[PDB]
Structure 1
Amino acid sequence: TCPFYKKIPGTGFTVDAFQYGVVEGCTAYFLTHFHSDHYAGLSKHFTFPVYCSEITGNLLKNKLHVQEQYIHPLPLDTECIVNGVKVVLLDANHCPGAVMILFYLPNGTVILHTGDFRADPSMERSLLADQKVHMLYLDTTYCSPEYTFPSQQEVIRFAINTAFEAVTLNPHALVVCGTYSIGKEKVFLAIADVLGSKVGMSQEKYKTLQCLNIPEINSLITTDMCSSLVHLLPMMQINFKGLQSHLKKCGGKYNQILAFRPTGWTHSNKFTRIADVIPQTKGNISIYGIPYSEHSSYLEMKRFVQWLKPQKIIPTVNVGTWKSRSTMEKYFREWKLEAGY
């Protein structure tokens, strides 16, 4: 059964609610982004209206084979009427196609649902600048002050400089990057660009990337592994055993692997600056864990909420324990008292 924080009151709408069968009273199902915890349940057999971005719609059609007649893509930054209710989709600064949704309820209430997001000051000059938001359904993934990490730009600078140094010292080194979902494409694209290579990958991953509206993508990716010195593999294979096995398959073209695992936050963020990060090494294989986040840091989240000044906050992540719920509620009260709303 569908939980309360996935229902939008007085609209007939649910958000990211495809794993509960037919939800009583739901006339339209919104999907914020194409990550499996959120799309869980969609297939070629779904026959209710789905509202989403153009990119999410491309993935629904081609990867999950949802029929075209049920996919309703909406442009960003544009007032749209859906089943008698005004809505707006805004970029969430998460993975490709990820949106936040603004709902203008018939009674005058205004709700913002962030989906998954990485809060940024640029959001303070979207269509949010205008009007009051009464209720905020908030991505609280990293809602605790211990969660610090660098900007995406600083992490990409580190990865580019590391890869370029290694391959210039050894032109027979292979670079490998882990993936298990869409998002974080800049990691492998930036490294391939500095090295003058296309990114090599499976047919299945190539298909997924072709759905994303990335400019000049045919120039950047390929299924021909032999032509490429940046390879993508499943995240599960980014370990000494799996990389040893991959190196065997490359027919003596390479004699070294440099690999990257883009994680979220890890406990080594409490001790180590991005500049100081070192790999794990065994023989001719080195593995770097890099803290590339597509979710708000604690400080980014706090700044956005203190700017927005919502009347009520409904968390959508870490909702399953009393300890987590009490911790989040204490932070929301601190933020409100400090800022005066």
Structure 2
Amino acid sequence: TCPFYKKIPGTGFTVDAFQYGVVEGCTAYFLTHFHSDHYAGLSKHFTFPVYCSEITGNLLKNKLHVQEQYIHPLPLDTECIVNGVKVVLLDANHCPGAVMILFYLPNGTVILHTGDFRADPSMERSLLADQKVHMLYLDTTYCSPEYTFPSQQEVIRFAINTAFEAVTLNPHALVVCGTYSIGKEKVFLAIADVLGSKVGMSQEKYKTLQCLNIPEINSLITTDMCSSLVHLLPMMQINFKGLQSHLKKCGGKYNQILAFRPTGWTHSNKFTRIADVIPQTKGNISIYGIPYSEHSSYLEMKRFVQWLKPQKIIPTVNVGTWKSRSTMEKYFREWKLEAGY
């Protein structure tokens, strides 16, 4: 049974709620972005409207095979009427095609649903700046002060350097990057760009990337592995036994892999900076963990909420235990007292 934090009051609208069957009263099903926890349930047999971004639309049509008519894509940054309710989609700074959604209720209430987001100061000069937001449905993935991590630009720097160093030192080494969903494309695109290569990948991953409206994408990616010196592999596969396995398949063309595992937070963020990172090493294979986050840090979230001064906050992440719920409320109360709203 659909939880109350996936419903929008005063509408027939639900958000990311595709796994409960038909939801009685729901005229419209919004999907914030193409990540399986959010889309769990969709298929070719869905005959209700889905409102989403164009890119999310492309992924629905091509990867899940939903029928063109039941996908309603919308442009971003554009006031749009949807069953006689004004809505806007806003860039969420999460993965490709990920959006936040502003709902303007007839009664005068204004609700922001963040989907998954990495909060940023550029959002403070968006359409959100123009009016009061009464309710906030919030991505609380990292709502605790331990959760610090570097900027994406800091991390891309490290990467571009590690990779380019080694390739110029040993020109028969391979760069690998791990992946399992959309997101974090900048990691491999940046490495390939500095090495003068295309990124090589499976047919299924090539298919996914060709739906993302990345400019000049035909010049950046290929399904020909042999021709390329940056390769993508399943994240499950980014380990010694599996990298060994893969190092065979290339057939005497490379004598060293240098892998990267972009991950979220891990407990070594609490004691080690980004300039001072190391890999695990079992012979000629070296696996880097690098903390490229597409979710708000604690400080980023805090700043965004304190600027927004919402009258009410409804968490969408870590809401399954009373302890987490209670911990989160305490932070929201601190923030509001500091800020005077």
* TM-score, normalised relative to structure 1: 1.00
Q: Distance in 2 between matches of 1:276 and 1:142?
A: 23
Residue of structure 2 in register with 1:331 after alignment: 331
CA distance in 2, matches of 1:44, 1:321: 34
The residue aligned with 1:304 is 304
Deviations 1:51-95 (A, max 9, x none): 000000000000000000100000000000101100000000000
Structure-2 separation of matches of 1:230 and 1:340: 51
Provide the residue aligned with 1:190 in structure 2: 190
C-alpha distance in structure 2 between counterparts of 1:6 and 1:78, whole Å: 23
Q: CA RMSD in A?
A: 0.4
Whole-Å Cα distance in 1 between the matches of residues 318 and 59 of structure 2? Answer: 27
Deviation (angstroms), 1:292: 0.2
Q: 1:102 is paired with a residue of what secondary structure?
A: strand
Structure 2 CA distance for aligned equivalents of residues 169 and 76 of structure 1: 45
Query: 1: distance between equivalents of 2:106 and 2:38?
Result: 27
- Tell me how far apart the structure 2 counterparts of residues 291 and 141 of structure 1 sit (CA, whole Å): 15
Looking at structure 1, the residues matched to 82 and 130 of structure 2 have their Cα atoms a distance apart, in angstroms, of 21
Query: In the TM superposition, what whole-angstrom CA distance separates every residue of 1:90-137 from its partner, at most 9, and x where no partner exists?
Result: 000000000000000111000000000000000000000010000000
What's the offset of the Cα at 1:166?
Answer: 0.7
Q: CA deviation at 1:279?
A: 0.6
CA distance in 2, matches of 1:176, 1:241: 15
| Counterpart for residue 61 of structure 1 | 61
TM-score (norm 2): 1.00
- Compute the displacement of 1:253 (Å): 0.2
Deviation at 1:305, TM superposition (A): 0.1
2:26 is paired with a residue whose SS is coil
Distance 1:209 1:248 in 2: 26
SS class of match (1:276)? coil
Q: State how far apart, in whole Å, the 2-side matches of 1:195 and 1:336 are.
A: 48
* Partner of residue 98, structure 1: 98
> How far does residue 164 in structure 1 lie from its aligned partner after superposition?
0.3
In the alignment, the residues of structure 1 paired with residue 329 and residue 240 of structure 2 have an alpha-carbon distance, to the nearest angstrom, of 42
Counterparts of residues 1-341 of structure 1 (less than 5 Å): 1-341=1-341
Alignment partner of 2:232: what SS? strand
- Other structure's SS at 2:60 match: helix
**Cα deviations across residues 24-44 of structure 1 (Å, max 9, x unaligned)?**
100000000000000000010
> Aligned equivalents of 1:271 and 1:241: distance in 2?
29
Separation in structure 2 between the aligned mates of residue 156 and residue 327 of structure 1, nearest angstrom:
33
What are the ranges of 5 or more consecutive residues in structure 2 without an aligned counterpart?
Answer: none
Secondary structure of the structure 1 residue equivalent to 2:236 = helix
CA-CA distance at 1:327 after TM superposition:
0.6
Query: Aligned to 1:207, what secondary structure does the other structure show?
Result: helix
Return the alpha-carbon distance in structure 2 between the equivalents of residues 250 and 54 of structure 1. Answer: 37
CA distance in 1, matches of 2:281, 2:160: 19
Residues of 2 paired with 1:70 and 1:284: CA distance? Answer: 50
SS of 1:38 mapped into structure 2: helix
CA distance in 2, matches of 1:241, 1:175: 17
Pairs aligned (count): 341
SS at match of 2:287: strand
Q: Deviations over 1:136-182 (max 9, x none)?
A: 00000000000000000000000110000011100000010000000
Runs (4+) of structure 1 exceeding 6 A deviation are none
For 2:267 and 2:164, the matched residues in 1 are separated by: 27
1:208-258: CA deviations, max 9, x gaps? 000000011000000000000100000000001100000000110001010
Q: Secondary structure at the match of 1:58?
A: helix
Secondary structure, in 3 states, of the residue corresponding to 2:226? helix
